[PDB]
Curated annotation (Swiss-Prot):
Top-level division of the source organism's lineage: Viruses
Protein known as: Helicase nsp13
Location of the CV ZBD domain: 1-105
Residue numbers binding Zn(2+) 13: 50, 55, 72, 75
Length: 572
């Protein structure tokens, strides 16, 4: 019960009992907190409560120290001091932002803005408070019980009355009862068990509520600039393939941490793997939030790095199928590929943290706590999608507030920028360059003359709140009859329900914009589905159209984004 203050490090015995994380607050800060919020419970060795029998006074502003005990105004002895007086709360060893983080419900974008603009210690307090709030909210959802099993991929569910039903998508992962993790997609529903189990009638599913551990490390260690490359030994015989990144690799060794903004198809994994070739004896840990981002780094390493010096770290509680070509769980290999939540406690010469737009400050702090490194390299793009904020329903979260790294890239600029898109036809590059990259992204490919747009609002139906636009799918079906090369296209939309309908009618493989991030396909067919803040988000739009290597068809609902697409318009 004795620790350091979350606002000024000052030692104290006080903790706020009303704060979900019970942070240590010194006398001067505890006061400024209790006197400005609904939080009045103060904790020490013993709580600050009226010691008089049967009395229920817990408010610190209505309590006094009567010798060594605590009493209210009704029970205090004549010789007593108020607990709250003179800008302090009585304790041993004798904030507007702290109050807002401590009392907010995390449903407003302004809550996330504050969590990223506050001091470093408050960024950790905000990250821990937010994550704990998110887990408690998982308890609010009703239990799903198997009413009947149709097949190996379809079943019927019975829901708990009086409790809301969580959204049905890949985002919401359930735990069967422990018959493995399971996901569902929309009376017949599609079930997806991580472990193959013959679904028993009567069995039930609940959201995996994990305990939020406290944070200790900053989101970003303090920056250090060096006069020479430090702790790393470069090659002189560096492959021509990687020559373009040599100055950037030297920048990496001459600073404690560095940020790399890599727009779609500009060479982020190529840069990441090339760093291993540039500092050939360096031990590098490659991390990202998702298994897919870690696997994409493994695929690039498989091509350039010796397979015997690589290891893919997989947590024993296996959720999705991941990279099989490296030795599994060998923490001491020179190259370690592992998701943030599975990171071991280790050291490295370089830590490469990829897909940085998807990280939260909680992830940034976890990395700094598990990995002690000479250099930290953050790779991603603040113009791409952030991690979903399940609690946030009011306001839009701007890229500068995704996390500390994205905030730096949007305010002072990234340390390094990969300026040439090698994936996309010039129509796509020119569109996103103007949209989100301030005209700094250059096209390498010519215009493919296979980038088309159609303005067609159609009809919007809804599967709960997830949207469907059957007429936009009908336009795609007509287009496919006329453009058979597009038979190989991936169908993309901002909605799972739109994708489920397109899958049955078109037979094309399907991705949401969010699940398509990091992937590329020759042909993409995109149906905007609706004109909402979700389907019009410029980062989501950017990711949607930069998935294409050769052609893209965009069936648009929004006039603004339609007019911005530098594509050939199709009639109807
Ligand atoms: Zn303090
Ligand atoms: Zn509090
Ligand atoms: Zn009392």
């Amino acid at each position: 019960a004795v620790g350091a203050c979350v606002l000024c490090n000052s030692q104290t015995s006080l903790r706020c009992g009303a704060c979900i994380r019970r942070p240590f607050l010194c006398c001067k800060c505890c006061y400024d907190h209790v006197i400005s919020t609904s939080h009045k419970l103060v904790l020490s060795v013993n709580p600050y409560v009226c010691n008089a029998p049967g009395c229920d006074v817990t408010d610190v502003t209505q309590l006094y120290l009567g010798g060594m005990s605590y009493y209210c105004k009704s029970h205090k002895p004549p010789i007593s001091f108020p607990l709250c007086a003179n800008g302090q709360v009585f304790g041993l060893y004798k904030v507007t932002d702290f109050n807002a983080i401590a009392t907010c419900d995390w449903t407003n974008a302004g809550d996330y803005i504050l969590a990223n603009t506050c001091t470093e210690r408050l960024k950790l307090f905000a990250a821990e408070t937010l994550k704990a709030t998110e887990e408690t909210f998982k308890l609010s959802y009703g239990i799903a019980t198997v009413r009947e099993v149709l097949s190996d991929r379809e079943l019927h569910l019975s829901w708990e009355v009086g409790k809301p039903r969580p959204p049905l998508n890949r985002n919401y992962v359930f735990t069967g009862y422990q018959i493995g993790e399971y996901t569902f997609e929309k009376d017949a529903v599609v079930y997806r068990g991580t472990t193959t189990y013959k679904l028993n009638v009567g069995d039930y599913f609940v959201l995996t509520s994990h305990t939020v551990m406290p944070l200790s490390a900053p989101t970003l260690v303090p920056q250090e600039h060096y006069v020479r490359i430090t702790g790393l030994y470069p090659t002189l015989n560096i492959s021509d393939e990687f020559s373009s990144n040599v100055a950037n690799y030297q920048k990496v060794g001459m600073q404690k941490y560095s940020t790399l903004q890599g727009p779609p198809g500009t060479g982020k994994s190529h840069f990441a793997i090339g760093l291993a070739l540039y500092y050939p004896s360096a031990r590098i840990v490659y991390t990202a939030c998702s298994h897919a981002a870690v696997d994409a780094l493994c695929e690039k390493a498989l091509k350039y790095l010796p397979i015997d010096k690589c290891s893919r770290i997989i947590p024993a509680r296996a959720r999705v199928e991941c990279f099989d070509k490296f030795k599994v769980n060998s923490t001491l290999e020179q190259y370690v590929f592992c998701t943030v939540n599975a990171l071991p406690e280790t050291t490295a010469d370089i830590v490469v943290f990829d897909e940085i737009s998807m990280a939260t400050n909680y992830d940034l702090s976890v990395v700094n706590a598990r990995l002690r490194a000479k250099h930290y390299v953050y790779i991603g793009d603040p113009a791409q999608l952030p991690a979903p904020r399940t609690l946030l329903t009011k306001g839009t979260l701007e890229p500068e507030y995704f996390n500390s790294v994205c905030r730096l890239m949007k305010t002072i600029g990234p340390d390094m920028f990969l300026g040439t898109c090698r994936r996309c036809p010039a129509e796509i590059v020119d569109t996103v360059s103007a949209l989100v990259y301030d005209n700094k992204l250059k096209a390498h490919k010519d215009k493919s003359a296979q980038c088309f747009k159609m303005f067609y609002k159609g009809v919007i139906t809804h599967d709960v709140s997830s949207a469907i636009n059957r007429p936009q799918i009908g336009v795609v079906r007509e287009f496919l009859t006329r453009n058979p090369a597009w038979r190989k296209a991936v169908f993309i939309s901002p909605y799972n329900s739109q994708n489920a309908v397109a899958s049955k009618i078109l037979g094309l493989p399907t991705q949401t914009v969010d699940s398509s991030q990091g992937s590329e396909y020759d042909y993409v067919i995109f149906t905007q589905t609706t004109e909402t803040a979700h389907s019009c988000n410029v980062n989501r739009f950017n990711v949607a159209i930069t998935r294409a290597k050769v052609g893209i068809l965009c069936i648009m609902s929004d006039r603004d984004l339609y007019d911005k697409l530098q594509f050939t318009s199709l009639e109807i």
